[PDB]
Amino acid sequence: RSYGPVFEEQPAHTLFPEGSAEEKVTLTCRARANPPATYRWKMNGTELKMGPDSRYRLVAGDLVISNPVKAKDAGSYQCVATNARGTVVSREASLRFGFLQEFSAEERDPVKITEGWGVMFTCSPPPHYPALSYRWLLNEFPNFIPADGRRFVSQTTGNLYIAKTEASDLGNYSCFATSHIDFITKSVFSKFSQLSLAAEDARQYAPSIKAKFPADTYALTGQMVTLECFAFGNPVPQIKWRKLDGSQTSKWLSSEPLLHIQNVDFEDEGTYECEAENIKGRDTYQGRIIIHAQPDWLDVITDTEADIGSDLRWSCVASGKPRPAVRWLRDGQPLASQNRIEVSGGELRFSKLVLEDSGMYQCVAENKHGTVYASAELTVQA
Amino acid sequence: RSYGPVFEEQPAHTLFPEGSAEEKVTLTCRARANPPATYRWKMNGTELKMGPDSRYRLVAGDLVISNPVKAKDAGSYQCVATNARGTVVSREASLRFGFLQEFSAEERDPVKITEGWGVMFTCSPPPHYPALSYRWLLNEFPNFIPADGRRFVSQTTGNLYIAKTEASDLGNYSCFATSHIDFITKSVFSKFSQLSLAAEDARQYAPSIKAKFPADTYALTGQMVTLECFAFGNPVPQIKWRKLDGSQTSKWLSSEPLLHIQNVDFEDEGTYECEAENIKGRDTYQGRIIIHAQPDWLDVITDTEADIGSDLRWSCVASGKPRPAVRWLRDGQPLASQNRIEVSGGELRFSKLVLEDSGMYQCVAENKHGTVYASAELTVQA
């Protein structure tokens, strides 16, 4: 029998590695239907101008863009499936471009500090997207500086921190930055800056946390979260982490500059504290982790066959934080209250259906973190 | 001038290939000194009973064992260098014996499975040491089964996995095991088990990971790590690996059943995920890699000449994970707090030295993964 389009595959957010031999990018879309559906792609809300003289070409629903470039192709794409019965739109997919420029060719400033004092070297990474991973080189590639408790590289800024400088630190320093996309990895490093040391200060001193984490970190359920904390101090301080709670018993989560929380959930929300300590004293720093969640369906609409003149009750309920807002679509178009149709939140109610109400409908749930779609075909029969 | 023993060559862990024409094994040891030092070897803490009627013989410090056998020679050996000035002990060296027995002579059980289903053949390797490398033979040697994505041999168990059985799999199967020690290689293979197939199931099905890796893998810095993952599925699934991180961008490390990480360091610690996918669905499995490190010296004692009645400050600092514990030795004997000697961790302090305190001293740093030694000669002069 004949039935409206039903998505089996929708476009996914895509990051295209600039430069790669690949001279084109494809956005997937497939909808089963009877008769088979036809497709149309929209970018930033506007339909794509196809044709032989166009950079776009379709391959059974999938959109193919030749010679992709950010200046012209970066944006949000949507797939529209249509057939005799009706039309439904797909989730939107963002197309972004990855890149990593070299550091500047300018020589880097030297640093002179009293042996014993801690010091921070600034990376100043070049333009790039998406975020990079960082390491530092001593004198030459590939002499990377190990994470040995006294030397730490922030993965947020790329800056190198030495808790207590020592004579062995004399040398030149370079920031090494890496971009990893799919299976492709590209690294670039800066010119080297010379570290010299003034007469030593052998006096011990209490720790002072220099590298910290945000006052507020927002993460989504299922995501992984990493917080950083590093201090200067003599002797080299030791770092410990804990989550504040009612319990008055000692509980530690990490004994390293980094605190990792896998597959976070709502229970992980709270205030976390980093403690840096040595025989001279201690320093602490606190910040919060707030847990939100992308929308997800709890209840959705399903194909319904009703008799003409009848009243129908349709609804969609979605979870998420912040609480998502539900809206509706009719054959790919926004559906609002009207003659015999009342749209209030996730509830759609028809008053005395008409043979013409038949078609494809979709309820959309959205919040600051994402959007989800649910579709169904309504068949009003006399 | 006269000075205590100083090691130039210490014994190394040794694996002796049983059977080899070599009818003796040698453990190296050499210490420079004035006058030249004398040597003594200890096994499992007890000194070796030398002599002409003994299986042991010395060759300028090196220990030579005639007709080595596990039942009597397997153990930990230590070299002791001594001269007028004092005594120092060497790092310990383990002597182990390599072997590989044949598989049992018993016939192997046949296997019958529905064509389309995946299947696993159990190797059940015979007694051996150290770990072997594995392959499987089809019908006869040397018809090895290639790693073609559909057929995989676990290097942990030696088991053969076929992701989706097909008519071409009909035949007999044997587990081929290889021991490689130094330049010597020895392989043995099992009798063959017959694979027969029942009427085919042509229906496709989502992947299911059957061969996995440990929930927790501990590796040492500089070491190489290999993780395995293989699934049954129709169509044959494709495997992909990634390390979980804060970054929300797609990053893959391998597109094969094996994931190899060369020269691991602390940054490689984390949770890794194997994904098996085909057009019907996907399966995943996660496990962790934890990075530790053998002790290494940061600061050690050096020959010191102090005046009688003087106070001396000696210390040794070592890196490593878990944090190593430092202990001391005086002329090869455990040194603990006493009259004028206070031993606290890696620090040794004498209160008003005496002409008799002169001698050889050693600080030892140890953790679950290894031990390191540092020595120096103390010369108390009036």
mmCIF file of C-alpha atoms in Angstrom, chain B residues 44-295:
data_model
loop_
_atom_site.group_PDB
_atom_site.id
_atom_site.type_symbol
_atom_site.label_atom_id
_atom_site.label_comp_id
_atom_site.label_asym_id
_atom_site.label_seq_id
_atom_site.Cartn_x
_atom_site.Cartn_y
_atom_site.Cartn_z
ATOM 1 C CA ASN B 44 67.370 -15.945 46.331
ATOM 2 C CA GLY B 45 69.248 -14.138 49.087
ATOM 3 C CA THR B 46 71.557 -17.047 49.906
ATOM 4 C CA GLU B 47 75.211 -17.118 48.854
ATOM 5 C CA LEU B 48 76.218 -19.715 46.261
ATOM 6 C CA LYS B 49 78.305 -22.670 47.398
ATOM 7 C CA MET B 50 81.226 -22.587 44.961
ATOM 8 C CA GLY B 51 84.011 -25.118 44.499
ATOM 9 C CA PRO B 52 85.390 -27.627 41.943
ATOM 10 C CA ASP B 53 82.636 -30.109 42.792
ATOM 11 C CA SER B 54 80.093 -27.347 42.212
ATOM 12 C CA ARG B 55 78.090 -26.538 39.080
ATOM 13 C CA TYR B 56 79.173 -22.913 39.467
ATOM 14 C CA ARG B 57 82.418 -21.323 38.304
ATOM 15 C CA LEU B 58 83.571 -17.714 38.087
ATOM 16 C CA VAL B 59 85.215 -15.983 35.150
ATOM 17 C CA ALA B 60 86.450 -12.604 36.355
ATOM 18 C CA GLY B 61 83.221 -11.678 38.113
ATOM 19 C CA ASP B 62 80.819 -13.406 35.724
ATOM 20 C CA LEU B 63 78.939 -16.414 37.092
ATOM 21 C CA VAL B 64 78.854 -19.549 34.944
ATOM 22 C CA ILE B 65 76.314 -22.313 35.516
ATOM 23 C CA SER B 66 76.950 -25.675 33.842
ATOM 24 C CA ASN B 67 73.985 -27.687 32.564
ATOM 25 C CA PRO B 68 71.312 -25.154 33.643
ATOM 26 C CA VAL B 69 67.921 -26.542 34.705
ATOM 27 C CA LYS B 70 64.817 -24.814 36.085
ATOM 28 C CA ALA B 71 64.293 -27.211 38.984
ATOM 29 C CA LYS B 72 67.651 -26.154 40.421
ATOM 30 C CA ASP B 73 68.783 -22.934 38.734
ATOM 31 C CA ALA B 74 65.586 -20.932 38.213
ATOM 32 C CA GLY B 75 65.641 -17.973 40.582
ATOM 33 C CA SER B 76 66.995 -14.500 41.339
ATOM 34 C CA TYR B 77 70.755 -13.907 41.287
ATOM 35 C CA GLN B 78 72.778 -11.057 42.781
ATOM 36 C CA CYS B 79 76.437 -10.079 42.449
ATOM 37 C CA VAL B 80 78.477 -8.833 45.402
ATOM 38 C CA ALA B 81 81.662 -6.847 44.749
ATOM 39 C CA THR B 82 84.139 -6.387 47.591
ATOM 40 C CA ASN B 83 87.569 -4.926 48.299
ATOM 41 C CA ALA B 84 89.470 -3.407 51.230
ATOM 42 C CA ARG B 85 87.348 -0.250 51.084
ATOM 43 C CA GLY B 86 83.949 -1.951 51.193
ATOM 44 C CA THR B 87 81.126 -3.938 49.604
ATOM 45 C CA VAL B 88 78.280 -3.162 47.188
ATOM 46 C CA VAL B 89 75.552 -5.419 45.792
ATOM 47 C CA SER B 90 74.254 -5.476 42.229
ATOM 48 C CA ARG B 91 70.713 -5.353 40.932
ATOM 49 C CA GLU B 92 69.084 -8.784 40.988
ATOM 50 C CA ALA B 93 68.722 -10.805 37.793
ATOM 51 C CA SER B 94 66.101 -13.485 37.205
ATOM 52 C CA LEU B 95 67.064 -16.687 35.416
ATOM 53 C CA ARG B 96 64.070 -18.321 33.730
ATOM 54 C CA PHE B 97 63.726 -21.228 31.312
ATOM 55 C CA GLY B 98 61.894 -21.161 28.016
ATOM 56 C CA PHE B 99 60.046 -24.158 26.656
ATOM 57 C CA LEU B 100 57.187 -25.186 24.382
ATOM 58 C CA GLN B 101 55.648 -28.646 24.585
ATOM 59 C CA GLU B 102 53.695 -30.270 21.764
ATOM 60 C CA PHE B 103 49.910 -30.155 21.857
ATOM 61 C CA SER B 104 48.218 -33.290 23.210
ATOM 62 C CA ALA B 105 48.122 -36.348 20.936
ATOM 63 C CA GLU B 106 44.348 -36.598 21.447
ATOM 64 C CA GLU B 107 42.082 -36.047 18.450
ATOM 65 C CA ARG B 108 40.227 -32.744 18.440
ATOM 66 C CA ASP B 109 36.472 -32.355 18.574
ATOM 67 C CA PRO B 110 34.668 -31.427 15.356
ATOM 68 C CA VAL B 111 32.450 -28.374 15.066
ATOM 69 C CA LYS B 112 29.158 -28.075 13.207
ATOM 70 C CA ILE B 113 27.470 -24.690 12.910
ATOM 71 C CA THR B 114 24.808 -23.039 10.737
ATOM 72 C CA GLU B 115 26.392 -21.379 7.702
ATOM 73 C CA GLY B 116 26.147 -17.654 8.388
ATOM 74 C CA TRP B 117 26.672 -17.946 12.143
ATOM 75 C CA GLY B 118 30.055 -16.854 13.427
ATOM 76 C CA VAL B 119 32.204 -19.444 15.204
ATOM 77 C CA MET B 120 35.210 -19.657 17.503
ATOM 78 C CA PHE B 121 37.712 -22.524 17.549
ATOM 79 C CA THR B 122 39.531 -23.002 20.834
ATOM 80 C CA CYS B 123 43.295 -23.402 20.631
ATOM 81 C CA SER B 124 44.061 -24.774 24.118
ATOM 82 C CA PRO B 125 47.832 -24.267 23.788
ATOM 83 C CA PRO B 126 50.160 -26.743 25.537
ATOM 84 C CA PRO B 127 52.432 -25.811 28.490
ATOM 85 C CA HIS B 128 54.969 -23.153 27.588
ATOM 86 C CA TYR B 129 56.965 -20.109 28.633
ATOM 87 C CA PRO B 130 57.097 -17.321 27.699
ATOM 88 C CA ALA B 131 53.963 -16.246 25.789
ATOM 89 C CA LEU B 132 53.551 -17.449 22.191
ATOM 90 C CA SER B 133 52.351 -16.017 18.900
ATOM 91 C CA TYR B 134 49.453 -17.835 17.217
ATOM 92 C CA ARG B 135 48.166 -18.710 13.760
ATOM 93 C CA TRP B 136 45.810 -21.371 12.388
ATOM 94 C CA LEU B 137 46.247 -23.898 9.593
ATOM 95 C CA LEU B 138 43.549 -25.032 7.184
ATOM 96 C CA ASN B 139 43.816 -28.727 6.277
ATOM 97 C CA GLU B 140 47.622 -28.846 6.240
ATOM 98 C CA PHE B 141 50.867 -27.057 7.019
ATOM 99 C CA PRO B 142 51.784 -24.451 5.819
ATOM 100 C CA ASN B 143 48.322 -23.303 4.721
ATOM 101 C CA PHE B 144 47.926 -20.527 7.284
ATOM 102 C CA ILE B 145 44.601 -18.714 7.542
ATOM 103 C CA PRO B 146 45.098 -15.046 6.614
ATOM 104 C CA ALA B 147 43.937 -12.117 8.746
ATOM 105 C CA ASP B 148 41.362 -11.020 6.172
ATOM 106 C CA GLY B 149 38.831 -9.210 8.349
ATOM 107 C CA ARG B 150 36.513 -12.240 8.506
ATOM 108 C CA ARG B 151 38.994 -14.595 10.191
ATOM 109 C CA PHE B 152 40.910 -13.465 13.261
ATOM 110 C CA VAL B 153 43.337 -15.202 15.622
ATOM 111 C CA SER B 154 43.548 -13.865 19.192
ATOM 112 C CA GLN B 155 47.134 -13.495 20.349
ATOM 113 C CA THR B 156 46.019 -13.778 23.964
ATOM 114 C CA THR B 157 44.190 -17.116 23.812
ATOM 115 C CA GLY B 158 45.234 -18.349 20.391
ATOM 116 C CA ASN B 159 41.558 -18.853 19.528
ATOM 117 C CA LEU B 160 40.353 -18.586 15.932
ATOM 118 C CA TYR B 161 37.265 -16.485 15.222
ATOM 119 C CA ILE B 162 35.265 -16.471 11.980
ATOM 120 C CA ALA B 163 32.864 -13.532 11.858
ATOM 121 C CA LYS B 164 30.433 -15.201 9.452
ATOM 122 C CA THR B 165 30.937 -18.788 8.315
ATOM 123 C CA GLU B 166 30.707 -19.430 4.569
ATOM 124 C CA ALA B 167 30.871 -22.591 2.434
ATOM 125 C CA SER B 168 34.579 -22.004 1.736
ATOM 126 C CA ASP B 169 35.266 -22.587 5.433
ATOM 127 C CA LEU B 170 34.522 -26.312 5.162
ATOM 128 C CA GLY B 171 37.708 -28.083 6.140
ATOM 129 C CA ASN B 172 39.918 -29.034 9.054
ATOM 130 C CA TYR B 173 41.501 -26.613 11.514
ATOM 131 C CA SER B 174 44.729 -26.645 13.530
ATOM 132 C CA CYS B 175 46.233 -24.218 16.051
ATOM 133 C CA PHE B 176 49.841 -23.266 15.175
ATOM 134 C CA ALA B 177 51.897 -21.889 18.086
ATOM 135 C CA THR B 178 55.320 -20.251 17.992
ATOM 136 C CA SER B 179 57.957 -19.520 20.624
ATOM 137 C CA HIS B 180 60.648 -16.995 19.730
ATOM 138 C CA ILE B 181 63.581 -16.491 22.108
ATOM 139 C CA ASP B 182 66.672 -14.565 21.022
ATOM 140 C CA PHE B 183 67.361 -15.906 17.525
ATOM 141 C CA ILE B 184 65.690 -19.271 18.163
ATOM 142 C CA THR B 185 62.167 -20.043 16.945
ATOM 143 C CA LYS B 186 60.152 -23.185 17.680
ATOM 144 C CA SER B 187 56.621 -23.898 16.453
ATOM 145 C CA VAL B 188 54.176 -26.707 17.216
ATOM 146 C CA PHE B 189 50.677 -27.300 15.871
ATOM 147 C CA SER B 190 47.644 -29.264 16.986
ATOM 148 C CA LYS B 191 45.807 -32.072 15.272
ATOM 149 C CA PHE B 192 43.001 -30.834 13.014
ATOM 150 C CA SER B 193 39.333 -30.443 13.919
ATOM 151 C CA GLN B 194 36.679 -30.715 11.221
ATOM 152 C CA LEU B 195 34.254 -27.870 10.550
ATOM 153 C CA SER B 196 30.955 -28.876 8.917
ATOM 154 C CA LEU B 197 28.051 -26.500 8.210
ATOM 155 C CA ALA B 198 24.298 -26.876 8.570
ATOM 156 C CA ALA B 199 21.799 -25.372 6.148
ATOM 157 C CA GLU B 200 22.588 -21.682 5.696
ATOM 158 C CA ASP B 201 20.906 -18.781 7.494
ATOM 159 C CA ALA B 202 21.048 -15.973 4.921
ATOM 160 C CA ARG B 203 19.492 -13.354 7.199
ATOM 161 C CA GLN B 204 21.717 -10.412 8.125
ATOM 162 C CA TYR B 205 22.318 -9.593 11.802
ATOM 163 C CA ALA B 206 23.936 -6.833 13.846
ATOM 164 C CA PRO B 207 27.481 -7.278 15.141
ATOM 165 C CA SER B 208 28.381 -8.803 18.498
ATOM 166 C CA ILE B 209 31.885 -8.353 19.858
ATOM 167 C CA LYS B 210 33.199 -11.746 20.962
ATOM 168 C CA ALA B 211 36.950 -11.226 21.363
ATOM 169 C CA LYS B 212 37.616 -8.362 23.788
ATOM 170 C CA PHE B 213 40.394 -6.796 25.832
ATOM 171 C CA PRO B 214 40.816 -6.489 29.627
ATOM 172 C CA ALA B 215 38.662 -4.144 31.672
ATOM 173 C CA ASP B 216 41.994 -2.820 32.952
ATOM 174 C CA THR B 217 45.383 -3.039 31.273
ATOM 175 C CA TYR B 218 48.475 -1.881 33.141
ATOM 176 C CA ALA B 219 51.486 -0.906 31.057
ATOM 177 C CA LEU B 220 54.830 0.730 31.801
ATOM 178 C CA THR B 221 56.112 3.915 30.137
ATOM 179 C CA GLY B 222 58.079 3.152 26.980
ATOM 180 C CA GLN B 223 56.319 -0.188 26.534
ATOM 181 C CA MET B 224 54.163 -1.157 23.548
ATOM 182 C CA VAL B 225 50.486 -2.022 24.094
ATOM 183 C CA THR B 226 48.172 -4.055 21.872
ATOM 184 C CA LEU B 227 44.413 -4.412 22.422
ATOM 185 C CA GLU B 228 42.111 -6.790 20.505
ATOM 186 C CA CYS B 229 38.503 -6.674 19.389
ATOM 187 C CA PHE B 230 36.611 -8.959 17.046
ATOM 188 C CA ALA B 231 32.938 -9.500 16.327
ATOM 189 C CA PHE B 232 30.530 -11.914 14.659
ATOM 190 C CA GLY B 233 28.066 -10.321 12.243
ATOM 191 C CA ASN B 234 26.496 -10.506 8.792
ATOM 192 C CA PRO B 235 27.698 -8.640 6.865
ATOM 193 C CA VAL B 236 31.183 -9.022 8.308
ATOM 194 C CA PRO B 237 31.577 -6.102 10.674
ATOM 195 C CA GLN B 238 34.144 -3.349 10.458
ATOM 196 C CA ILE B 239 36.107 -2.464 13.607
ATOM 197 C CA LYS B 240 37.107 1.054 14.694
ATOM 198 C CA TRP B 241 38.919 2.275 17.812
ATOM 199 C CA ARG B 242 38.969 5.571 19.688
ATOM 200 C CA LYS B 243 40.089 6.907 23.060
ATOM 201 C CA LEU B 244 37.416 8.667 25.079
ATOM 202 C CA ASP B 245 38.200 12.321 25.755
ATOM 203 C CA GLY B 246 36.546 15.667 26.375
ATOM 204 C CA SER B 247 36.827 16.561 22.693
ATOM 205 C CA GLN B 248 33.495 16.055 20.949
ATOM 206 C CA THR B 249 35.019 15.549 17.509
ATOM 207 C CA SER B 250 35.360 12.210 15.720
ATOM 208 C CA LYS B 251 38.858 10.775 16.246
ATOM 209 C CA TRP B 252 39.823 7.211 15.288
ATOM 210 C CA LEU B 253 43.039 5.355 16.134
ATOM 211 C CA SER B 254 42.612 2.132 14.155
ATOM 212 C CA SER B 255 40.280 0.508 11.643
ATOM 213 C CA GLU B 256 41.417 -3.044 12.412
ATOM 214 C CA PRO B 257 40.743 -5.711 15.087
ATOM 215 C CA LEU B 258 44.032 -4.680 16.713
ATOM 216 C CA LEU B 259 44.932 -1.329 18.243
ATOM 217 C CA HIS B 260 48.661 -0.787 18.758
ATOM 218 C CA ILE B 261 50.129 2.015 20.878
ATOM 219 C CA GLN B 262 53.898 2.435 20.564
ATOM 220 C CA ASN B 263 56.151 3.776 23.324
ATOM 221 C CA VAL B 264 53.309 4.577 25.709
ATOM 222 C CA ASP B 265 53.561 7.412 28.194
ATOM 223 C CA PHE B 266 51.325 8.826 30.894
ATOM 224 C CA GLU B 267 49.167 10.697 28.384
ATOM 225 C CA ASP B 268 48.068 7.379 26.874
ATOM 226 C CA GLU B 269 46.239 6.414 30.070
ATOM 227 C CA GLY B 270 42.482 6.470 29.611
ATOM 228 C CA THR B 271 39.405 4.581 28.454
ATOM 229 C CA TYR B 272 39.426 3.041 24.983
ATOM 230 C CA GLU B 273 36.489 1.902 22.931
ATOM 231 C CA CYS B 274 36.163 -0.716 20.224
ATOM 232 C CA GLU B 275 33.237 -0.343 17.835
ATOM 233 C CA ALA B 276 31.986 -3.113 15.530
ATOM 234 C CA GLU B 277 29.547 -2.045 12.839
ATOM 235 C CA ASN B 278 27.684 -3.279 9.769
ATOM 236 C CA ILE B 279 24.531 -2.160 7.933
ATOM 237 C CA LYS B 280 22.342 -3.828 10.572
ATOM 238 C CA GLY B 281 23.749 -2.138 13.669
ATOM 239 C CA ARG B 282 26.687 -1.674 16.018
ATOM 240 C CA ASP B 283 28.220 -3.042 19.214
ATOM 241 C CA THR B 284 30.844 -1.438 21.433
ATOM 242 C CA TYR B 285 33.155 -2.435 24.259
ATOM 243 C CA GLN B 286 35.332 -0.302 26.537
ATOM 244 C CA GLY B 287 38.336 -0.940 28.746
ATOM 245 C CA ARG B 288 41.065 1.091 30.394
ATOM 246 C CA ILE B 289 44.813 1.449 30.029
ATOM 247 C CA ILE B 290 46.594 2.571 33.201
ATOM 248 C CA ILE B 291 50.167 3.793 32.927
ATOM 249 C CA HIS B 292 52.772 3.060 35.602
ATOM 250 C CA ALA B 293 56.563 3.334 35.579
ATOM 251 C CA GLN B 294 59.629 1.550 36.943
ATOM 252 C CA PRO B 295 61.771 3.522 39.400
#
